[PDB]
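Weekly structure sync, notes
Attendees: PL, DS, HV (note-taker this week)

Item 1: Thioredoxin reductase 3
DS walked through the input record. Source organism listed as Mus musculus. Sequence as pasted into the shared doc:
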Amino acid sequence: AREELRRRLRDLIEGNRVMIFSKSYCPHSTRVKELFSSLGVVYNILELDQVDDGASVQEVLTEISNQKTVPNIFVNKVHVGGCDRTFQAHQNGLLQKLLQDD
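Item 1 (cont.): predicted structure, written out as tokens:
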């Protein structure tokens, strides 16, 4: 079933222009999402700690970035990075242009 779940985590990027994953008590991964809001753009808030499949959903997600947290930054069916990219591109203007279109 691990494939069935992951299949949804990869589609969530297409079903939503901007989607970010996080948890209940996991810093760094939550802040990256707070940036979008301040970017005058809209995004979806999803917490693997409150999801029924928080075990698997986060099992395949945590690997996406292989980080203690579940940081997921992907807008317009593209990868941003985070922990340096999502933060830099913001002040660099590479992010504002992404969330706006690309």
